[PDB]
Subunit: 284 residues, 4 copies
């Protein structure tokens, strides 16, 4: 299975913060935003990960991640000329995907909790599509899945939502998604829609939908309030429960993709922020 | 008076966040970090403002700020190739400063409260230097002033921090030049202040009771800053350091310009506050 | 002008917290809830303050506040046998008020900012009624005032005519007692403060002021609003070095207690940190 | 095994808050403080629970908890004349404990996370004593346990000026029946109190103190200062807002244990309608 992080977009909902910088390079407490979706792929067992970025923001990502060898992975890059839809991930990313299955994660999404770690490897064998559902108070802000207990309908940002279940930005597909995505026309709102990709899998009878487990947090960081709330959550997990979450150096180390020497290496550079100290303790 | 914002630095206390974004382009709730020291200069009535940035981050600043004209100011850019210390502000910015007095603000500082708004205009006339003091529990983390003004020491003989806002007459260009490095290895703003102190030409004001001064340079201090700004909006209905507001209140842009900035920033909710300013 | 704090009620919106203890004895960061409305009355210059409580919660209040002498005021008590509504403050409190004007503050309310400190003494000379207005995003939760000047007043409207809540601070001349005595129970089953205000509005004798820009107003009667309030107060201290609604400070600033008395208060409260602030006042 | 919650104390470190309310009746977000230690005992499988309070604070606890039957538990109420120390729990509570083992939990403590739920029942068979350890930045502020080279407990000190480790000893203790006589033999410490640390020292010196470092990802909190109380409330709200969990809900535990049935749970939900807390109970039934 190959991994893609959609990390472009104009970030208009964060202006003026994102006039000067990509949403995906914004801090969430103690690490760049892009670290969270990066680690979600890594935890699913994926080592070949492509970022799709705008042309103008790519150098930021290159400066931050290079080719990902320091994290035990192969990170590569592709460019999206304008932000004309999430379903373009599979078109732009088709070379990267090859003949494999794919996991797409959105660059502004944070997944945390039971079932959202190393157990995501269960999706590597995907046949058809697999997507998720997460109860929210305001479903009209998201893609929405309606159940009957199987999935019944999907709608992007419905003015009259048919459930309270948002569809988070993590999607697993077999290789058929490339042809599905290539065949899509632009929606009314001007975009190649991931919700329409999911519709085709649904029509065929091979969309699986799983409600995220009790105790899971899912966050989209695309508003001033949700970005700040995400940071507070991550800090709270460290201060109260002693956990640093989505630390790619740790995940790479726990998966065996880098050794102790390398871990120490990464830690030394990050000593002064406090981030590198966390890394050191993992050893002792 | 001309304005300089130091907005370079390596940001090593924020790694890895600052491996991919400048500290001065960090979000602090509803706006980027640079907006805070920028609006502090604008409130002092300063329209000639040079950002010193690193070569690599400069593009982000440009995309955000351009030439300033939309905020009714003249934003100019200079490069500092290496973060060799704060006093390089004056050497690097000397063509900018010219024959004028100068306000230097640090790119990662927030000033909020009594006496830190449009009353700052009074410093335009500065002769000598003028700096500030602010009580803090952890005086070691900052530069430090003792009163009888008595001693300055960069990182205690008191609990008074010297925050990152400094006003100098034209002499500072020469004084910065006539310096040579500290034990860690930087040209320190603290030494400039020492020089002015030595001639008996440094004024120091304790910031007013109830002022907030913040430095966003660590994971906790940044997040605490963000939280503070949001708290001001949710609890007190105040949006702070909005440059379009300051410019509009100063007469530097007009109603229809304001309405344009607002339309451009409508999706995030930031523009809606600018529209409310008219109603 | 005399003062009343309504500090009874059942606290159902905080159950099961308030199955133990009164809402008005809950912490907000560094002090009991009741200190905020108490200090409001004090900043208005009022020294004769009656607390109305339930019968069962009274001992908590007596333990905390006693007769108020340590704060340079006279705190007295009355009980409300059932929580039959806010306007009963003026019936229960009739003897306390006597012939005087009165300020009523609700026990779960925090007022902070410009115009909400010692400048409140300007209301002592009230003729008629004077109430306030504060923009909230969710007006249906509160008393609501519509402007055109005040056009209408409605208690928790399903379709609010404005975003302006009517906060729990009210100043009235002596006529309020008879107005309250004449009320019947609303559809809700309570003698409503909103109806008292309606009577003054009917008579053209209700003044309404929108709270100043930069003011905070809070009602702490939900889990979220209680916790939000605590976070706000701690933020003021951590970020701006302010401790707010400290009654010892207010009393000392009014001349009601002296330096040596302030020291005694500080000494009583030193293990928590609260007393250290009081010592820092002296310098 | 019997349970005791120590819920007295003067609460001086929270004055003036605790001049008007017991620390153990303070709000922690959506429930009183006392519900956390109570639910800890219940999750250990303990239904016979003694609450020790001050005499003046007792009525508030009775108003809250009544006879405990709504939670499927039996509540014995005791009072402590003066706050003379933690080990007095076993003297006051001697009749309550009888011949059984006992769990003691401190009224101002919150335990959350792996190993601190229903798996606590593993301590009912305790022989000797069993206590815990939790890394803190400021161990001076707590009882402190030092481990030897072989990883076993080596020393215990209450609030040492020079801590020998960073491991605080949290306020949850499991003991066999010998604890009563041990506690009976104690003299007041240099703080003037009958200390829990001295009880634990007796068992350690006897070679029968077991100490477990709390599992990775656990939260342990003491709510006895303005900042720790507020931090605790923030934590509990974040778990709901972000992870969709309400924690230490004793009605839920009683219902999961089979101590109350569906109709009883609804009855509790109905008493708790206006706050949101009851609505959570209704959601459990689905
Ligand atoms: C439209 C577009 C977006 N992006 C990036 C930016 C974000 O990291 C990510 C998703 O864009 P956003 O504008 O944040 O999308 P958002 O409104 O949050 O909605 C999406 O994300 C939601 C979950 O966060 C889903 O429930 C929706 O079904 C899905 O459409 O993709 C691209 O890289 N290219 C694009 O063309
Ligand atoms: C290993 C590791 C994990 N995490 C995060 C990822 C998740 O949000 C959270 C839990 O991840 P993991 O511990 O790998 O466990 P998870 O994927 O939930 O799998 C567990 O939970 C599943 C569902 O209960 C079980 O079926 C599995 O057997 C069990 O291993 O911790 C980090 O942030 N950093 C890490 O290094
Ligand atoms: C060294 C250096 C820094 N910078 C930028 C980064 C920051 O915006 C600002 C100050 O750099 P920082 O490393 O944050 O400095 P910091 O440790 O906070 O200390 C300074 O700022 C403190 C106030 O925050 C003062 O109390 C100290 O006296 C002063 O030394 O200048 C530059 O643009 N160029 C530079 O060469
Ligand atoms: C009904 C009743 C309440 N009380 C106490 C409890 C509270 O401290 C205070 C107010 O009662 P609460 O139930 O919070 O009222 P609440 O729903 O917030 O609304 C009141 O207060 C709101 C402002 O907080 C106003 O906007 C409303 O017009 C007013 O009716 O009075 C009494 O002492 N006796 C009572 O009969
Ligand atoms: C002295 C005393 C206290 N209490 C109650 C109040 C609290 O809920 C609980 C503990 O008293 P506190 O004064 O908070 O104790 P505290 O300083 O936190 O320290 C205790 O609890 C700490 C854990 O929170 C331990 O690490 C210490 O070893 C232990 O002595 O017992 C009583 O019921 N009776 C008492 O005599
Ligand atoms: C005028 C103005 C002030 N402020 C801030 C600056 C100060 O921190 C605070 C008070 O400033 P100001 O009202 O200008 O007061 P002063 O006369 O004390 O200088 O409000 C803004 O954030 N935006 C604005 O448009
Ligand atoms: C004097 C004083 C005011 N305050 C609060 C009350 C108000 O919320 C705010 C300002 O009050 P104050 O300075 O008295 O101003 P005003 O003249 O505007 O009424 O500070 C305290 O908390 N403690 C005090 O001792
Ligand atoms: C069963 C249950 C557990 N919990 C809490 C207790 C613990 O802090 C955490 C885990 O408890 P539990 O799931 O019982 O697991 P363990 O087997 O690790 O003991 O969840 C509740 O808050 N409510 C509940 O109803
Ligand atoms: Cl109430
Ligand atoms: Mg998004
Ligand atoms: Mg700094
Ligand atoms: Mg109320
Ligand atoms: Mg018995
Ligand atoms: Mg304690
Ligand atoms: Na037994």
């Amino acid at each position: 299975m190959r991994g893609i992080i959609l990390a472009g977009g104009s970030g208009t909902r964060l202006y003026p913060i994102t006039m000067g910088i990509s949403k995906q390079l914004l801090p969430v407490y103690d690490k760049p935003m892009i670290y969270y979706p990066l680690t979600t792929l890594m935890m699913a067992g994926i080592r070949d990960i492509q970022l799709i970025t705008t042309p103008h923001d790519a150098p930021g990502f290159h400066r931050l991640l290079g080719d990902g060898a320091h994290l035990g992975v192969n990170i590569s890059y592709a460019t999206q000329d304008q932000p004309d839809g999430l379903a373009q991930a599979f078109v732009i990313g088709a070379n990267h995907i090859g003949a494999d299955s794919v996991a797409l994660v959105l660059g502004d999404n944070i997944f945390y909790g039971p079932g959202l770690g190393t157990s995501l490897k269960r999706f590597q064998s995907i046949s058809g599509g697999a997507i998720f559902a997460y109860w929210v108070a305001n479903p009209s802000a998201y893609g929405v899945v309606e159940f009957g207990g199987m999935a019944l309908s999907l709608e992007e940002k419905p003015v009259t939502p048919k459930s309270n279940y948002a569809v988070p930005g993590l999607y697993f597909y077999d290789n058929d998604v490339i042809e599905i995505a290539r065949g899509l026309k632009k929606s009314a709102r001007g975009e190649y829609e991931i919700t329409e990709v999911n519709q085709v899998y649904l029509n065929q009878g091979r969309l699986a939908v799983e409600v995220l487990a009790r105790g899971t947090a899912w966050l989209d960081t695309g508003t001033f309030d949700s970005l700040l709330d995400a940071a507070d959550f991550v800090r709270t997990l460290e201060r109260r429960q002693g956990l640093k979450v989505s630390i790619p150096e740790e995940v790479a180390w726990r998966m065996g993709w880098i050794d102790d020497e390398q871990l120490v290496q990464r830690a030394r550079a990050l000593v002064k922020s406090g981030y590198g100290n966390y890394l050191l303790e993992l050893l002792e």
